[PDB]
């Protein structure tokens, strides 16, 4: 849909959301993409307040999140440091 780029400061606890999706772990039938399922209270994503449950993750910094496995996505999002560009697209 509309490409949103959200800029986040990584909190001590991490980014403050949870994801599902990936190759071999579809969150929706026929769709491999990475989705945000939860935004925890008091976290970085919550307090910035642009990210939303249901949002498809497209990229984190210099790493692409289209058609990757759940594990490639998890290491990509956890191997960040302090400052993060998050590319997402909002649901239709």
């Amino acid at each position: 849909a509309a490409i949103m780029e959200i800029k986040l400061i990584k909190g001590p606890k991490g980014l403050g959301f949870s994801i599902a999706g990936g190759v071999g772990n579809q969150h929706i039938p026929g769709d491999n993409s990475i989705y945000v399922t939860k935004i925890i209270e008091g976290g970085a994503a919550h307090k910035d307040g642009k990210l939303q449950i249901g949002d498809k993750l497209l990229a984190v910094n210099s790493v692409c999140l289209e058609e990757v496995t759940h594990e490639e996505a998890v290491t990509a999002l956890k191997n960040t440091s302090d400052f993060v560009y998050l590319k997402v697209a909002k649901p239709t």
Binding site: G14, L15, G16, F17, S18, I19, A20, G22, N25, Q26, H27, T37, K38, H70, A73, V74, L77, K78
Partner: peptide, 7 residues
């Protein structure tokens, strides 16, 4: 069954 990960 699907995997959800904290981040």
């Amino acid at each position: 069954n699907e995997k959800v990960s904290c981040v």
